[PDB]
Amino acid sequence: XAXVXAXV
Amino acid sequence: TXPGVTXPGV
DNA sequence: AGCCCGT
DNA sequence: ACGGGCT
Ligand SMILES: *C(=O)c1cnc2ccccc2n1
Ligand SMILES: *C(=O)c1cnc2ccccc2n1
Ligand SMILES: [Cl-]
Ligand SMILES: [Cl-]
Ligand SMILES: [K+]
Ligand SMILES: [Zn+2]
Ligand SMILES: [Zn+2]
Ligand SMILES: [Zn+2]
Ligand SMILES: [Zn+2]
Ligand SMILES: [Zn+2]
């Protein structure tokens, strides 16, 4: 749930 | 990093 | 060549 | 159940 590379 | 040496991240 | 996350 | 972004 973070988006630092994926954003789920 | 940076750019350079994005971020992290983005 | 250069890093690292939270619901 | 998840991989991104220029100097
Ligand atoms: C977002 O909070 C979060 C936390 N853990 C994960 C594990 C695997 C895929 C996505 C995730 N997202
Ligand atoms: C996003 O593309 C990405 C890839 N690897 C990671 C490792 C650890 C924390 C965050 C990350 N994000
Ligand atoms: Cl060298
Ligand atoms: Cl990974
Ligand atoms: K080198
Ligand atoms: Zn390169
Ligand atoms: Zn790692
Ligand atoms: Zn975690
Ligand atoms: Zn991964
Ligand atoms: Zn990548």
JSON list of C-alpha atoms (C1' of nucleotides) and ligand atoms in Angstrom, two decimals:
[
{"chain": "A", "resi": 1, "resn": "UNK", "atom": "CA", "xyz": [0.00, 0.00, 0.00]},
{"chain": "A", "resi": 2, "resn": "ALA", "atom": "CA", "xyz": [2.89, 2.42, 0.02]},
{"chain": "A", "resi": 3, "resn": "UNK", "atom": "CA", "xyz": [3.96, 3.77, -3.39]},
{"chain": "A", "resi": 4, "resn": "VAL", "atom": "CA", "xyz": [7.67, 4.42, -3.00]},
{"chain": "A", "resi": 5, "resn": "UNK", "atom": "CA", "xyz": [8.14, 1.50, -6.95]},
{"chain": "A", "resi": 6, "resn": "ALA", "atom": "CA", "xyz": [4.79, -0.30, -7.01]},
{"chain": "A", "resi": 7, "resn": "UNK", "atom": "CA", "xyz": [1.69, 1.28, -5.50]},
{"chain": "A", "resi": 8, "resn": "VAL", "atom": "CA", "xyz": [-0.73, -1.37, -4.28]},
{"chain": "B", "resi": 1, "resn": "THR", "atom": "CA", "xyz": [19.12, 8.44, -5.90]},
{"chain": "B", "resi": 2, "resn": "UNK", "atom": "CA", "xyz": [18.74, 12.12, -6.71]},
{"chain": "B", "resi": 3, "resn": "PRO", "atom": "CA", "xyz": [18.88, 12.45, -9.64]},
{"chain": "B", "resi": 4, "resn": "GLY", "atom": "CA", "xyz": [21.61, 11.65, -9.57]},
{"chain": "B", "resi": 5, "resn": "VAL", "atom": "CA", "xyz": [23.62, 9.49, -7.13]},
{"chain": "B", "resi": 6, "resn": "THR", "atom": "CA", "xyz": [14.98, 9.67, -8.10]},
{"chain": "B", "resi": 7, "resn": "UNK", "atom": "CA", "xyz": [14.96, 9.72, -4.33]},
{"chain": "B", "resi": 8, "resn": "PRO", "atom": "CA", "xyz": [14.90, 7.05, -3.29]},
{"chain": "B", "resi": 9, "resn": "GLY", "atom": "CA", "xyz": [12.34, 6.58, -4.32]},
{"chain": "B", "resi": 10, "resn": "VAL", "atom": "CA", "xyz": [10.60, 8.12, -7.37]},
{"chain": "C", "resi": 1, "resn": "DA", "atom": "C1'", "xyz": [25.83, 4.41, -11.11]},
{"chain": "C", "resi": 2, "resn": "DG", "atom": "C1'", "xyz": [22.53, 5.16, -7.54]},
{"chain": "C", "resi": 3, "resn": "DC", "atom": "C1'", "xyz": [18.02, 2.59, -3.43]},
{"chain": "C", "resi": 4, "resn": "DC", "atom": "C1'", "xyz": [14.16, 0.77, -0.81]},
{"chain": "C", "resi": 5, "resn": "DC", "atom": "C1'", "xyz": [7.61, 0.56, 1.68]},
{"chain": "C", "resi": 6, "resn": "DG", "atom": "C1'", "xyz": [3.09, 0.45, 3.76]},
{"chain": "C", "resi": 7, "resn": "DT", "atom": "C1'", "xyz": [-2.25, -0.35, 4.37]},
{"chain": "D", "resi": 1, "resn": "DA", "atom": "C1'", "xyz": [-1.33, -8.07, -2.64]},
{"chain": "D", "resi": 2, "resn": "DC", "atom": "C1'", "xyz": [4.10, -5.09, -5.09]},
{"chain": "D", "resi": 3, "resn": "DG", "atom": "C1'", "xyz": [7.82, -3.06, -8.32]},
{"chain": "D", "resi": 4, "resn": "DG", "atom": "C1'", "xyz": [9.92, 3.05, -10.46]},
{"chain": "D", "resi": 5, "resn": "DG", "atom": "C1'", "xyz": [12.47, 6.89, -11.51]},
{"chain": "D", "resi": 6, "resn": "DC", "atom": "C1'", "xyz": [17.07, 11.10, -14.67]},
{"chain": "D", "resi": 7, "resn": "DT", "atom": "C1'", "xyz": [21.09, 13.46, -13.56]},
{"chain": "E", "resi": 1, "resn": "LIG", "atom": "C1", "xyz": [1.00, -1.77, 1.29]},
{"chain": "E", "resi": 1, "resn": "LIG", "atom": "O1", "xyz": [0.80, -1.32, 2.44]},
{"chain": "E", "resi": 1, "resn": "LIG", "atom": "C2", "xyz": [1.64, -3.18, 1.22]},
{"chain": "E", "resi": 1, "resn": "LIG", "atom": "C3", "xyz": [2.23, -3.91, 2.25]},
{"chain": "E", "resi": 1, "resn": "LIG", "atom": "N1", "xyz": [2.74, -5.10, 2.02]},
{"chain": "E", "resi": 1, "resn": "LIG", "atom": "C4", "xyz": [2.66, -5.63, 0.78]},
{"chain": "E", "resi": 1, "resn": "LIG", "atom": "C5", "xyz": [3.17, -6.91, 0.53]},
{"chain": "E", "resi": 1, "resn": "LIG", "atom": "C6", "xyz": [3.08, -7.42, -0.74]},
{"chain": "E", "resi": 1, "resn": "LIG", "atom": "C7", "xyz": [2.47, -6.68, -1.75]},
{"chain": "E", "resi": 1, "resn": "LIG", "atom": "C8", "xyz": [1.96, -5.43, -1.53]},
{"chain": "E", "resi": 1, "resn": "LIG", "atom": "C9", "xyz": [2.06, -4.91, -0.25]},
{"chain": "E", "resi": 1, "resn": "LIG", "atom": "N2", "xyz": [1.56, -3.68, 0.01]},
{"chain": "E", "resi": 2, "resn": "LIG", "atom": "C1", "xyz": [9.50, -0.24, -6.32]},
{"chain": "E", "resi": 2, "resn": "LIG", "atom": "O1", "xyz": [9.76, -0.40, -7.53]},
{"chain": "E", "resi": 2, "resn": "LIG", "atom": "C2", "xyz": [10.35, -1.02, -5.28]},
{"chain": "E", "resi": 2, "resn": "LIG", "atom": "C3", "xyz": [11.19, -2.10, -5.51]},
{"chain": "E", "resi": 2, "resn": "LIG", "atom": "N1", "xyz": [11.86, -2.68, -4.50]},
{"chain": "E", "resi": 2, "resn": "LIG", "atom": "C4", "xyz": [11.71, -2.22, -3.26]},
{"chain": "E", "resi": 2, "resn": "LIG", "atom": "C5", "xyz": [12.42, -2.83, -2.22]},
{"chain": "E", "resi": 2, "resn": "LIG", "atom": "C6", "xyz": [12.24, -2.34, -0.93]},
{"chain": "E", "resi": 2, "resn": "LIG", "atom": "C7", "xyz": [11.39, -1.26, -0.67]},
{"chain": "E", "resi": 2, "resn": "LIG", "atom": "C8", "xyz": [10.69, -0.65, -1.71]},
{"chain": "E", "resi": 2, "resn": "LIG", "atom": "C9", "xyz": [10.86, -1.13, -3.02]},
{"chain": "E", "resi": 2, "resn": "LIG", "atom": "N2", "xyz": [10.17, -0.55, -4.05]},
{"chain": "E", "resi": 3, "resn": "CL", "atom": "CL", "xyz": [34.98, 2.28, -11.99]},
{"chain": "E", "resi": 4, "resn": "CL", "atom": "CL", "xyz": [11.56, -7.03, -4.16]},
{"chain": "E", "resi": 5, "resn": "K", "atom": "K", "xyz": [32.70, 1.31, -10.69]},
{"chain": "E", "resi": 6, "resn": "ZN", "atom": "ZN", "xyz": [22.72, 2.61, -15.90]},
{"chain": "E", "resi": 7, "resn": "ZN", "atom": "ZN", "xyz": [16.63, -5.59, -1.51]},
{"chain": "E", "resi": 8, "resn": "ZN", "atom": "ZN", "xyz": [6.17, -4.55, 5.18]},
{"chain": "E", "resi": 9, "resn": "ZN", "atom": "ZN", "xyz": [9.80, -7.28, -5.37]},
{"chain": "E", "resi": 10, "resn": "ZN", "atom": "ZN", "xyz": [13.05, -1.54, -11.57]}
]
